[PDB]
Design a protein around this ligand. Structure first.
Ligand SMILES: Nc1ncnc2c1ncn2[C@@H]1O[C@H](COP(=O)(O)OP(=O)(O)O)[C@@H](O)[C@H]1O
Ligand SMILES: [Mg+2]
Lengths: 52, 54, 103, 161
């Protein structure tokens, strides 16, 4: 009998679950982990190797 | 005469500088490509793994 | 990835005294890039979606992630530097053959 | 008299004021005037505020004038305060214990009266397990962090004690 309830008549267990999820997310990353990552890319530098 | 022939031998060995430069350009581009592929793979797998872990 | 094997003392005999540091830096970067190509494989392991099809109970997010990834155009960097060192090698070979005819 | 209290006060000055979380100082079997000095210095420097709820340090003192039971359990009391701050608040805690050796010493003082056969140098046979039970709670978990600075007295300068 848990249709109308998410977590089977809890009435609690959110005050600590939010801290736990905060720790878990912040140790997995900092950005939004519900969307595809956009990729900034860089290109290697190069110098004047020409014979002086 | 011997000195001149030795100078010619060094001139014959000259090309290694440009071999080195070409090696470094090719290797830098390959390293960059593989690092980019690992970055994209790691980000995708990392987000999927955050979902599976929560 | 076809490289030109190089003697490393012959490379030393042909370096003037105004670019010894540059030769040493090219050598060090050659060794560094060899080591770094050795310490990472060629192709990333494409993870099977199995562990992400049957273990993610979310509405198609894994599926749209896999669709967006299967058709990604990751930028392959272009050379833009080998042609000019080839031109420089041509010029240097010209000068060296001239000096050799003089010799 | 080599500088354990001077060093731990320097660390309180250099780290605890620049610290973002809370702090707990457990005085265990030390000088009472040192506790008075620390109290009034923390009031002067604003780290303890007697008028509102902006205080950042909790003090727990059982000093060298206390019988061995109080000296043996006051470190546990300080641990309990720091453990609450680490678990239920999720805070990053600083825990300074001066001096932790007294804990062990206090146990020694009661070990004979509890009817136990003495171990090496007259210490209780349970020295290592008592120390472990106490020290394993002084730790960083994946629920919160505790950075711990413990001054450890060395009897007669013998590090093999
Ligand atoms: N960092 C220091 N600089 C100068 N003197 C010091 C320093 N630390 C200790 N001392 C000297 O050693 C004495 C003992 O200091 P204290 O820390 O209270 O000893 P204990 O090791 O018992 O805690 C001090 O009064 C001081 O004279
Ligand atoms: Mg002291």
């Amino acid at each position: 009998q848990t249709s109308g309830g998410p977590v089977d008549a809890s009435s609690e267990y959110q005050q600590e679950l939010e801290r736990e999820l905060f720790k878990l997310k912040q140790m997995f990353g900092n950005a939004d982990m519900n969307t595809f990552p956009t990729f900034k890319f860089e290109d290697p530098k190069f110098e004047v190797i020409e014979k002086p | 005469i011997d000195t001149e022939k030795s100078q010619q031998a060094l001139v014959q060995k000259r090309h290694y500088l440009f071999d080195v430069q070409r090696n470094n350009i090719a290797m830098a581009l390959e390293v960059t490509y593989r690092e980019r592929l690992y970055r994209v793979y790691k980000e995708v797998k990392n987000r999927l793994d955050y979902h599976i872990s929560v | 990835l076809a490289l030109k094997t190089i003697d490393w003392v012959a490379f030393a005999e042909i370096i003037p005294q105004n670019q010894k540091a540059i030769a040493s830096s090219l050598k060090s970067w050659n060794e560094t890039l060899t080591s770094r190509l050795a310490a990472l494989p060629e192709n990333p392991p494409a993870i099977d979606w199995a562990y992400y099809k049957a273990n993610v109970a979310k509405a198609g997010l894994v599926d749209d992630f896999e669709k967006k990834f299967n058709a990604l155009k990751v930028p392959v960097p272009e050379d833009k530097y080998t042609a000019q060192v080839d031109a420089e090698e041509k010029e240097d070979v010209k000068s060296c053959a001239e000096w050799v005819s003089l010799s | 008299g080599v500088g354990k209290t001077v060093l731990i006060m320097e660390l309180i000055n250099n780290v605890a004021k620049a610290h973002g979380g809370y702090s707990v100082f457990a005085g265990v079997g030390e000088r009472t005037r040192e506790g008075n000095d620390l109290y009034h210095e923390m009031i002067e420097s604003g780290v303890i505020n007697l008028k509102d709820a902006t205080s950042k340090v909790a003090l727990v003192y059982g000093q060298m004038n206390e019988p061995p039971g109080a000296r043996a359990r006051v470190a546990l009391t300080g641990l309990t305060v720091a453990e609450y701050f680490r678990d239920q608040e999720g805070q990053d805690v600083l825990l300074f214990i001066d001096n932790i050796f007294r804990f062990t010493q206090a146990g020694s003082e009661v070990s004979a009266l509890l009817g136990r056969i003495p171990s090496a140098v007259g210490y209780q046979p349970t020295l290592a397990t008592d120390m472990g039970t106490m020290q394993e709670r002084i730790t960083t978990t994946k629920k919160g962090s505790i950075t711990s600075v413990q001054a450890i007295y060395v009897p007669a300068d013998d590090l093999t004690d």
